[PDB]
Amino acid sequence: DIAGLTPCSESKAYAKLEKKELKTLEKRLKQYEADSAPAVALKATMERTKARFANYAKAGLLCGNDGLPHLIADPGLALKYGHAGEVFIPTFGFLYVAGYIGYVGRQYLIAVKGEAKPTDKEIIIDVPLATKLAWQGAGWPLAAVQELQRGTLLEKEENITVSPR
Amino acid sequence: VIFIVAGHMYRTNFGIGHRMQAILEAHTPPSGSLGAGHKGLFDTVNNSLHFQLGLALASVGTITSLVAQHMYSLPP
Amino acid sequence: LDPQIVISGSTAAFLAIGRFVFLGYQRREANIFATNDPAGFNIIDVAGWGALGHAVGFAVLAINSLQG
Amino acid sequence: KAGNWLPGSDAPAWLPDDLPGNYGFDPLSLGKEPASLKRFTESEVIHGRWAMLGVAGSLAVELLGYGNWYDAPLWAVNGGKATWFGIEVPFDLNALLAFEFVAMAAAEGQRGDAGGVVYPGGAFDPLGFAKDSSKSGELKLKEIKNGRLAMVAFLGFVAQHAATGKGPIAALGEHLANPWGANFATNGISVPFF
Amino acid sequence: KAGNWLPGSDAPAWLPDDLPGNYGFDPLSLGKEPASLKRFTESEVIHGRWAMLGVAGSLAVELLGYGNWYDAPLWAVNKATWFGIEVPFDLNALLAFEFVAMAAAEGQRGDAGGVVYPGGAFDPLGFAKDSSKSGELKLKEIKNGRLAMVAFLGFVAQHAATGKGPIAALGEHLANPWGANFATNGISVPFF
Amino acid sequence: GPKRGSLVKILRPESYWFNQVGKVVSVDQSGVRYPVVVRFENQNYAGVTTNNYALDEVVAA
Amino acid sequence: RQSWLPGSQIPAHLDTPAAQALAGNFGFDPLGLGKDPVALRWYQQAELIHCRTAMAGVAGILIPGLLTKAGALNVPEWYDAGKVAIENSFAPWGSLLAVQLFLCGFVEAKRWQDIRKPGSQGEPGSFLGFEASLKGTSELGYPGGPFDPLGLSKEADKWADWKLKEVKNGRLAMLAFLGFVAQKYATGAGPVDNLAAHLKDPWHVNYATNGVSLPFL
Amino acid sequence: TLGLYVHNDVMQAFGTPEKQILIEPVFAQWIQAAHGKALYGFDFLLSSKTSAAFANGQSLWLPGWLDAINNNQNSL
Ligand code: CLA
Ligand code: CLA
Ligand code: CLA
Ligand code: CLA
Ligand code: CLA
Ligand code: CLA
Ligand SMILES: CC1=C[C@H](O)CC(C)(C)[C@H]1/C=C/C(C)=C/C=C/C(C)=C/C=C/C=C(C)/C=C/C=C(C)/C=C/C1=C(C)C[C@H](O)CC1(C)C
Ligand SMILES: CC1=C[C@H](O)CC(C)(C)[C@H]1/C=C/C(C)=C/C=C/C(C)=C/C=C/C=C(C)/C=C/C=C(C)/C=C/C1=C(C)C[C@H](O)CC1(C)C
Ligand SMILES: CC1=C[C@H](O)CC(C)(C)[C@H]1/C=C/C(C)=C/C=C/C(C)=C/C=C/C=C(C)/C=C/C=C(C)/C=C/C1=C(C)C[C@H](O)CC1(C)C
């Protein structure tokens, strides 16, 4: 497929690694009783192992010459060959939650600078104001591009600089 | 052949040739995106030796990386 | 092939094209010592434009010699 | 002012209204500085005239039956002789490159020795269509509009041959044969996901 | 004022009474501004005249027995004919002559500023040299042109529905009126 | 110069509060070279919140 | 006044004379997205466009989907209608999408420049004769002229009622289309089939039983 | 980079190498296919036989470069 990588459902070293991990787990299993708690724990481990290999072969992952899932990081190649759920959807999910955190922190800072004790609100957190901004920060990309388009996202050159600027 | 052609570029005592300060004064773009451009840099490269040694060491270090990268893969 | 025709023609073409249409531009951009040519086309101008002429002529001869 | 490229928007204050072709189109603000603007007026008129000659040449090659504009220099690669209206031309690529370099160097150098001459007149205007000084601006506006159309048409020639691989008259024949099954979206090149 | 498109309604204040075909019909208020309304008077008269000529052409083609207006350009997709006599041309040459002739005539018409009624060489018989019955003839002209525009759009929709010419479908309506109309069609009313 | 309590802006480039806003405490009316006393809400690297400035080093902005 | 929660405080930006007179104002901005009035103007426009195209789309779902359970109009499902339509059509879907992108881009850019300047598309010379009827009607988002043929916008005493009926039917059609999408993924049948299944056994066929919407039960 | 290495170390420690984040270097492999390497299957500009650069360089310098770039026993 991409870069000479076989799919994991077609790869043989993938099945070999699955069989090898099941073999290690059953070699650890065969020295206990039938209905004992280590036996139940190792059977749950084997169940999760089989379910994980079935889920990785189900999702269309690409395996290499060693039988391990490889990820594709190019928007067009992954959207073309159906690999968008491994980098592209995760990178926009991360940018949503990271900009969430940053926008809530920025709104807390601008909310506490307008008082007689900004540092005292920085040490001891105003919990109702923090929860209010935490719930209101779900529309952070819209509010971010609106603050970008008004010129209120940036401070002007009233910033602190050195004598050679 | 390319270096012997390139070594006939600048103006010595023969009338023809490029004048380096004129080249530096020319390359200043409109809209002031580089400010004054490369104006006044001829008297800061020629008068300073640490600027020249910095340029020389930047070039020679990148060329030494180039020597290593091209001699492991294309062994002469 | 005809080496003399190609070299002499390229040299004549570059010397004429530097004598007539690129002389005034080269004088404006530059602003041994004296010849009696009426446009100041001295020995070093002859050397530069003939060097370009020989270079382009031998380039044409080499590309023709490869037949490509 | 010739018109407005986008109705309702303001025209930029650096584009004078007397200038031919002034639709107010400058989103990237490239012509804000006057010396750059003067050079761009020169370059737009020159690019437009060369593109009119190029599009007229490509059309006259393919309509009269001598291949397309892409197959025209292919005699110089293979073993072949040049032609013009069917009549053979007894020259080789080195000789033609020499003639073109000397002649175009002379003409371009004489044009470049002049300062800012875009509309020269005189020997370049023998029939005297611009000897009125009041009807000249309408002809200049016609010239810049046919030139913009010719530049867009020549870039369309290049992109159509880079995508489909045929002549423009043959592409027009395919678009008249099946307009819905033969266009830039039935291509596999211009839009990768169609 | 030529009449009233809807009785009880009011006349729009931007339509003057010294203008042919002024039934007061402007629901969308398209010609409220005078330059727009001048251009639309020009366009209405030109569309009406071309539609009169086109409807008379389609009627003459089908009544004189040479196919209909739809069968006429079929030779070029496949030999031209006129009055049953062949015409020795192809669509490239016909398109060239038509483009040159229409470009010249249209350009001479567009050189004039707002001339809807030229007269002169276009009017050899001198009907409008009196300025009393001329407005009545203009009103007759705009009503006949509106009727011909409606007739040609009826021809296009009627052939897109049935697949037949106007005179043949007129004969079908005269033969079986309650079994050949826009509703036994199965297209104009999508149910039943 | 500027009055007591007014907000000024510092143009001394080798200061900690250059291009920043403080509050005038007093202006000495003698022939002192740096009469404008400006306090700042934040301290410098030496823990000081007060500096003396000249007239052309403060702008009431 | 009327609110989405009786008892919650109305935000201060939706309680202004410029916001109270818009259409369908109920003080509903818990994320505070409309605090900037330029942003609230832009979001009014986006809401009107989503309302109108959502109503037109959901009508295209329902009325062919209701009449196909009656006698006439053998119409496929909306998640299958594009494939059957492109089998019956004359063009491939990429060419048709390119044509609709140019045709929608022209119209949408007209509306774009009318948002950016209200008195914008009434430039003389810019259009052949449609330039004088492409202005607004003093309230942006509500154009006149060739839009609104029947002249119902002319009467002033019905006008807030027409606006508020439009915004309520539009918000409700947006919920209808999002329900079409979610119902399509969870069940795999059509929305009229979902309505027939909820009417046949309401207390057993719903989203607590589909096994998708809340999988902890 | 440290998070991906620590993640893969935790996957190797816990006995499950199939969970570890292995991002494929498709951009430098795209460059290698652009230089004539027939292992990644992109087939463009020097790796496709129907390319203009492939056909123009074919008579003179490409048959040595291709033989040396498709060998996996050198560092090229
Ligand atoms: C971080 C830099 C980067 C790099 C090195 C690549 C590299 C690549 N891209 Mg990707 N891409 C990227 C980021 C990048 N991408 C981003 C940010 C986007 C969103 C805009 C995309 C969206 C995208 C699409 C839709 C496509 C690619 C494709 C490709 C491959 C060939 C592209 C080419 O030949 O043009 C030279 C490379 C560049 C100019 C680098 C920038 C890439 C731009 C954004 C897209 C170029 C697409 C190209 C014009 C289409 C080629 C069609 C192909 C059949 C020949 C190449 C592996 C194509 C592919 O899938 O090939 C198999 C393809 O169709 N990319
Ligand atoms: C390349 C030749 C060229 C040059 C030098 C100019 C120069 C000018 N144009 Mg003209 N224009 C051109 C081509 C050119 N134009 C074409 C082909 C069209 C039709 C699309 C127009 C349509 C046009 C209008 C409607 C107007 C102008 C105007 C102007 C003037 C001011 C704008 C400016 O400063 O941009 C300078 C232009 C350039 C620097 C061109 C280079 C652009 C960049 C560097 C690269 C662009 C690459 C291109 C997008 C690639 C397409 C790839 C394709 C596959 C999609 C200036 C004299 C305004 C005017 O007042 O007329 C006199 C004006 O109203 N132009
Ligand atoms: C100069 C105007 C012009 C005209 C008349 C044509 C005509 C054509 N093009 Mg070409 N093309 C053009 C410019 C033009 N193109 C430009 C600027 C590009 C680079 C982006 C291309 C790149 C291109 C490709 C890749 C392909 C075509 C193809 C075609 C044919 C099918 C229609 C189509 O899908 O076009 C594509 C449409 C556009 C690129 C947009 C056109 C918008 C223009 C540039 C703006 C000006 C138009 C003006 C407002 C109205 C038309 C005036 C004209 C009738 C005189 C048709 C004969 C296809 C073909 O080969 O058919 C078999 C095809 O695959 N064209
Ligand atoms: C063909 C184009 C055309 C044009 C440009 C005009 C223009 C005009 N008409 Mg005329 N009209 C026409 C055809 C046209 N008409 C036809 C075919 C009829 C018979 C149905 C009429 C019946 C009529 C009456 C009774 C009156 C006018 C009047 C006018 C004038 C003022 C109205 C106005 O400002 O709107 C400008 C007009 C347009 C912009 C027309 C463009 C077409 C629009 C944009 C789309 C229409 C599509 C159409 C409804 C499709 C029908 C399909 C069918 C299956 C339903 C203006 C000069 C009034 C007048 O004062 O006479 C001079 C008047 O009282 N018209
Ligand atoms: C100009 C006037 C006019 C006349 C005399 C006719 C006559 C006819 N039409 Mg046509 N048609 C017209 C306009 C006209 N049409 C228009 C404007 C359209 C587009 C909406 C059509 C679209 C159409 C279709 C799809 C079909 C016909 C068919 C027919 C034929 C059957 C009767 C019928 O069902 O009519 C059609 C009924 C209407 C169009 C509704 C009536 C509205 C009219 C236009 C109002 C004006 C009429 C006027 C008050 C009285 C007649 C004036 C006349 C004497 C000058 C009949 C010969 C059918 C056929 O082919 O039969 C075999 C058929 O299937 N017509
Ligand atoms: C637009 C209004 C609307 C209506 C009338 C329906 C109706 C239905 N839904 Mg659908 N649905 C909707 C929107 C709607 N849904 C939305 C927005 C979603 C995404 C959250 C879904 C996701 C969904 C799933 C996953 C399933 C259904 C199912 C059903 C059916 C069983 C009842 C049920 O459990 O609903 C679920 C109810 C909701 C998800 C909440 C409704 C949201 C609205 C806005 C609440 C307000 C309603 C209002 C106060 C009163 C109703 C208005 C009505 C009179 C028009 C019933 C036919 C089930 C089915 O297919 O049965 C065969 C089923 O499994 N719906
Ligand atoms: C204005 C502006 C402004 C703002 O600010 C920004 C922007 C937008 C960016 C801008 C824009 C721009 C543009 C669009 C451009 C384009 C251009 C072009 C197209 C050119 C061409 C141009 C073109 C041209 C010259 C051309 C020419 C041509 C020629 C000679 C040809 C020739 C030929 C022929 C005959 C044929 C044969 O067989 C071959 C050949 C050899 C091939
Ligand atoms: C007035 C108004 C106003 C308000 O305000 C609003 C509203 C209401 C919108 C408006 C209305 C409008 C309308 C109704 C319109 C319509 C039109 C038409 C119908 C046209 C046609 C029109 C039509 C036309 C011209 C036509 C023409 C035709 C022709 C030439 C034909 C030709 C032909 C022939 C011979 C035959 C052959 O084989 C072919 C052909 C080639 C085919
Ligand atoms: C207000 C607010 C505010 C605060 O601050 C916060 C919050 C709460 C967040 C917010 C909320 C929001 C929301 C809820 C939103 C939603 C929206 C939607 C749902 C839309 C839809 C929307 C929807 C839409 C457009 C839709 C449309 C549709 C359509 C066209 C359809 C079409 C079609 C048809 C016919 C059929 C065929 O076969 C296919 C198709 C093609 C498919």
Ligand SMILES: CC1=C(/C=C/C(C)=C/C=C/C(C)=C/C=C/C=C(C)/C=C/C=C(C)/C=C/C2=C(C)CCCC2(C)C)C(C)(C)CCC1
């Ligand atoms: C006096 C006179 C005259 C005559 C003139 C003449 C005849 C001139 C000539 C001149 C000449 C005749 C010159 C020449 C020059 C040349 C040169 C200066 C050369 C150089 C060369 C080179 C530099 C080369 C190099 C190389 C080599 C060595 C190797 C290979 C590579 C190459 C090619 C690079 C006349 C009649 C007009 C008029 C009267 C006056």
